[PDB]
């Protein structure tokens, strides 16, 4: 039983609805000596992971396949994890869990691109890349903002 | 008993699940309203976005800890949802909307009872003008389903 | 026996004859005041027209009907209109202009004091909104009349 | 009619303020599928027809006359006629009563366009000619969303 | 030996500089208590008879005609009149002298409205028509300013 | 003979053989006033777009029906169209630019006068609209060329 | 056989018939949704004209010559046209359409493959982004017509 | 003792004390965060400047007069300021901004129940936005010392 | 015994009393040019609060510490201030403002003289463009007030 | 002996005569370079128009009079005028305007050695500003030419 | 060369640099009759390859890699040739310049287009190719300019 | 020995490594204050490669020829760099930052004596206005450090 791009577009749709609901997490819990900059930047990843997601969502209806539209669904499906806010994280223990959901996107991505490739659907494949090269660069910025090189 | 943060809290979890309805509408409409409609859903998503941020940071000023996780979010709402498995016509989907609306609109009202008690004087009127826009949206999706606000 | 769906459409008629006014002076006046004061009525014209219509259609939302032809209007208001036959000075208008704007400002008082004892809370606060700038309006004509805000 | 330039002009003040306030009643009161696009539609019509109303004024203040500038005198003197909401309308019932407005403004502007043309008012006459220019666009439009041709 | 379009066109290019040069004059020199309010308002007929003045100088190169060109030129054939500013005037004066400039522009548009019809010139006649409209508005402002009707 | 509705729909030919023209000048022109008249062609391809759709528009308002093919376009229009095939010059494609717009001058004077006949004020100062912005394109593409306007 | 320049001029001459009967839609489109849809047309008119742009300068970029006749564009062209004659209902009109952006989605995937295998990948990655949009619209006007984007 | 032109007038005096204050903040601040920092007190130099402006104006619409002289403002305020003399951390600037804040969220506490308590409506109505926007300020601040709000 | 850390310094403080001094007039002024003025002195606002703040951070880039409270302002200006007690004519408010600013513009005279011989040659050129700016204000001003720039 | 005030009105003459032949080579150009150099001409009309209307009101602020006729200017101004009677090549007409920019910049430095030796730092600094822009334009202009700006 | 796709994003850094040097040189040595428009369209070019470079740099980052940041690596490694202003240039000989240095950015460009493809970095690929269609339009305009075709 | 066209062309030279510099310290900085420095050296980049070319520009208007190529510009430049090899904290980065901003502005002081005293008013200035610029920029960066501006 193999995946699909349907199936992979859909699993990404689930992903991006968890990401987006943890940057707010991390937008609305974060504290110490950098909270005005990284509170507007989490703001910025909002907008942009969403529209993604609106994209990425639409792509599949194009392509005659189904979207996941309920927080059910998304729960279900995403390989994102998730968890409560109960005892205060550092910053830097927030943008730790930010780069790895970033990370683990990008890998998907990666999957998804071989994907895309392989099946011939050149459209999908060249939105993914797009996508990905935004996810390279930030994971770029924040790492450094953890004073550690990108691949590191 | 409900208190002020527990209610502020129970609406957060509300308007994440209404504004993923939201998404569902605009991805699967169908029919010759399609374009207005599917424009029309873009502009509810931000503006009732906009109301959750905003009630979870009021949550965070007065003391309080807002949910913020789909899991915490599907345990507390009473907003209900389901996916889409079976055609729905704009009637029927507008249909959703409405009634999800007049949820809101009630619950806020609660709300706005709630917080005039207690002497939350910035709470009660930011529920205040949201419950405003409500009752204008309830109006205008009303009349496209050729009824008056209140039938 | 009056209710708040009876002092919005009252306040509906009311703001058509305002606007109307405004109007009539933005075109009659004369003096060296002029271009500052003619491009003011525009203003005003403006900012009454967008109350008229947020009177009317909050109206709608809770269950109302609201007057919509010239004859209602002049049936139901309380605002005072005159045709302009013989020569104003500036000063005789803007004695007119706020004179209207103070009638309006204790009518609105009346209705917040309705809508408060009624427990319409978004009325309320939209009437309150209103009378603020009503006020401020009040004070800036005053001063240009060489007079305080309550006198 | 017997009426030279200053009373056609005053005239069209007392028309377009019952006009306008026509178009809020469609405005406020219209139900059906078509609501959004109507309503906001009519707010653009406000828009513009006021301003129509503004400009009549003003060029007969420029040649010397006096605007009619209260309710009672716009009643008193206008040939659009208004009638109070009472009883449900269709949204094409409605369309047709603004499209009716609209040819009749047509129609006497056309009789303003010849005695201006008459009386050697060259400005008033084209004013009023731009003025009937955007009103035949209208009539096309609105008679076509009700399925006709713009002259039948 | 009549007047032609051409001739026309070009004398009120000459009109049009004597005219934009008094506009300045005022705008420096003006004293009084409505000081900020018509200094500024000198900006915009500045502008808006600057305009008027290209405009007409490129309608007759589109002739086949040769505008004036030189303050000389302007000086020899403008019917506007100008004065040093030697002793000082009320802002009424002011406005006074700006309001007959403008009647006298208004007056001599409309000899060109009739000649342009006459031979013609239908493009020239609507521009000219344009611009009297604007001229007869701004008439009406500035005899409201002085306390007067239109054309009183 | 040619009535109103005929003479625009001629226009509305004409106007799409000069809007493809106007494309072809800008693709394939060279020479070392390369890029001013690359945006140049620009300018007028959306200006006398334009043109075509207000006359296509103003024949619908009036009662007719416009020509919308391109197999119309080329049996009704008096413009002249040729493949590129051998090298032109930028005066070359220029005095074939101005050509083609002393064409649409003296046609729309045709189209002046007849709308004078007929009564269509409407229709004639559109056209004389037109006629001022083509006359003033002429000057200035005459004088690119070293020309008096009318020469 | 077809080279990635003959593709090109291909589709030059499929654009410029597409854009016009766009224009034709736009202009004789009736029904209840005309306010909406007569701004799409303005909407699709633009993008595809700038598609149309964008090919022939590519064309011209990798050194070929683009069509630049109505004569050329109806002698290449495999978007078909007719004339506006009996009336067609705004579905009518949108299947059309429809039908047009099938056709070009799929002649695009043939240029894809082709700029492919040639190696001209700037040309391949611009026939995608022009896909990506196509595909988009397709969805979105099977929706207006109540039916799924690849029924 | 304390009606609410008083009142007011004490939130003239205190506004101005403390949009110096946010001034002295702005130049003498030193650290790390400075470019962040140093861009926020002009964002809230502009928000209190302008509350103290709206704040004087109610003033006036009401009848009062309100204080407009450093004497008056220091003669009455009960907002504190000190010469800077020696260095101070950007963590000491901050917490003195921050008890500014909280000083000013009480005494706006106390003016809206003032207000409620003698009627003025649009009075109490901007204390309260008013102070929506301080308790946001103090979360915001708060966080970034490390503190919850009202720690 | 001045130099330029301690001209720089006096200039803080006076344009902090004038500023508070335009705000004065703002509120208070009363009469037929009040529309005019009153938006004039938010402009005036906002360009000496601009110097103030460029005159203060010019001071700590040449090694200064500004003055930052208002204690310290009253200290050291030589900009005069008086409580709003009795009703004054626009006139005599603009007489006010008027000597405000040939006070400015003759301090400033010395310290562009003073810079000029210390040999700051940023500073000289920022208050050479301060005066050109208070020269014009002057200019205007006096012309309000009938008379002649230096009468 | 020539003063401060009598240069500047010198310039308000020579400045007026300027805008004007500048109006005349935009008018009267022909050849290749026609369209890039006809909005060139508008871009120096307004920067010329600017700096005459700066230097007449900077000789108002220190109590002077400007030339305010044509006569005035034509009987003052040192820059020449001659009708357009034959043709002249774009080169020409450049070398006419580089001629002009040449002379008002050897004015303008005679302007700035004597305001600053009579200490107007006002007057010196503005006319060190309009004589960078010179400089700047006549580089480019002797560009266009084929020279090096100073030959 | 003997190149991966880390050293040859660097070595066209070092060319970029280089580049838009040379863009400024002929911005500020430039004369004849074409000077004003070829004066802004440098401006332009600066930008759009300014910010090439600035992508390309970072695109270096993202992938692990280590940009070239001096003047003096930029002359060492890069093959874009630079030579003094010191004798008189036609406009002519400067655009072939700016044209031979686009032409030589294109054929790399594609050798990195073809190296990217076989490692498999996807993005680098798509930045590339969006920057060599740039590149290829300007060369069609720049070569039409001095009257040639595109690939002559 | 050295007159004013050597000086500019030598910061000509000194502005383009200093350009490098600040895009090296963008591309490679680390820490914490990341994302503000970053956008920050942006900033930079834009103002002094603006100076860069004003210098430039004002060379040619004076009869000069700029440095224009690399080769030129490391064989003169006075500013120094060195490749980034091994790791350097935010602060290091900074104070080299810093360190380049102190020797451009002692050496713009020794231009702006040298055309003091040559007499070039126009460079004189232009080199005055960078030097308040950068006067600023080292208040502003030795407050993120931590340190007084001249310390
Ligand atoms: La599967
Ligand atoms: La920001
Ligand atoms: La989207
Ligand atoms: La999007
Ligand atoms: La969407
Ligand atoms: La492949
Ligand atoms: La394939
Ligand atoms: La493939
Ligand atoms: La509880
Ligand atoms: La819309
Ligand atoms: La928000
Ligand atoms: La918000
Ligand atoms: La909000
Ligand atoms: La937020
Ligand atoms: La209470
Ligand atoms: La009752
Ligand atoms: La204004
Ligand atoms: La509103
Ligand atoms: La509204
Ligand atoms: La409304
Ligand atoms: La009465
Ligand atoms: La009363
Ligand atoms: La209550
Ligand atoms: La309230
Ligand atoms: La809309
Ligand atoms: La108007
Ligand atoms: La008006
Ligand atoms: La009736
Ligand atoms: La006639
Ligand atoms: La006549
Ligand atoms: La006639
Ligand atoms: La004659
Ligand atoms: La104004
Ligand atoms: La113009
Ligand atoms: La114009
Ligand atoms: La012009
Ligand atoms: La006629
Ligand atoms: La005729
Ligand atoms: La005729
Ligand atoms: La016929
Ligand atoms: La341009
Ligand atoms: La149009
Ligand atoms: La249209
Ligand atoms: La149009
Ligand atoms: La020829
Ligand atoms: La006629
Ligand atoms: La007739
Ligand atoms: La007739
Ligand atoms: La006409
Ligand atoms: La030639
Ligand atoms: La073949
Ligand atoms: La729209
Ligand atoms: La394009
Ligand atoms: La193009
Ligand atoms: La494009
Ligand atoms: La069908
Ligand atoms: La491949
Ligand atoms: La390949
Ligand atoms: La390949
Ligand atoms: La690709
Ligand atoms: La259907
Ligand atoms: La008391
Ligand atoms: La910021
Ligand atoms: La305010
Ligand atoms: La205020
Ligand atoms: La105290
Ligand atoms: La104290
Ligand atoms: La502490
Ligand atoms: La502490
Ligand atoms: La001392
Ligand atoms: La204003
Ligand atoms: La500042
Ligand atoms: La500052
Ligand atoms: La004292
Ligand atoms: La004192
Ligand atoms: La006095
Ligand atoms: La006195
Ligand atoms: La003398
Ligand atoms: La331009
Ligand atoms: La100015
Ligand atoms: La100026
Ligand atoms: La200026
Ligand atoms: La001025
Ligand atoms: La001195
Ligand atoms: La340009
Ligand atoms: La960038
Ligand atoms: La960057
Ligand atoms: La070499
Ligand atoms: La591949
Ligand atoms: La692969
Ligand atoms: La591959
Ligand atoms: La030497
Ligand atoms: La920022
Ligand atoms: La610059
Ligand atoms: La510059
Ligand atoms: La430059
Ligand atoms: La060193
Ligand atoms: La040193
Ligand atoms: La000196
Ligand atoms: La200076």
Request: net charge positive.
């Given at each position: 039983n193999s995946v699909d791009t349907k199936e992979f577009l859909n699993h990404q749709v689930a992903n991006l609805?968890?990401?987006?609901?943890?940057?707010?997490?991390?937008?609305?819990?974060?504290?110490?000596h950098n909270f005005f900059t990284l509170h507007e930047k989490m703001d910025d990843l909002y907008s942009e992971f969403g529209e993604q997601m609106d994209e990425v969502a639409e792509r599949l209806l194009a392509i005659g396949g189904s979207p996941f539209s309920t927080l059910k669904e998304f729960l279900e499906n995403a390989s994102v994890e998730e968890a409560p806010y109960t005892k205060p994280k550092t910053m830097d223990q927030l943008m730790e869990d930010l780069v790895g959901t970033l990370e683990l996107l990008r890998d998907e991505y990666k999957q998804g691109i071989e994907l895309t490739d392989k099946e011939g659907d050149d459209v999908t494949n060249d939105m993914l890349i797009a996508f990905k090269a935004s996810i390279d660069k930030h994971i770029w910025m924040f790492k450094a903002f953890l004073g550690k090189a990108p691949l590191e």
């Open positions: 609805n968890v990401f987006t609901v943890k940057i707010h997490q991390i937008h609305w819990y974060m504290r110490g």
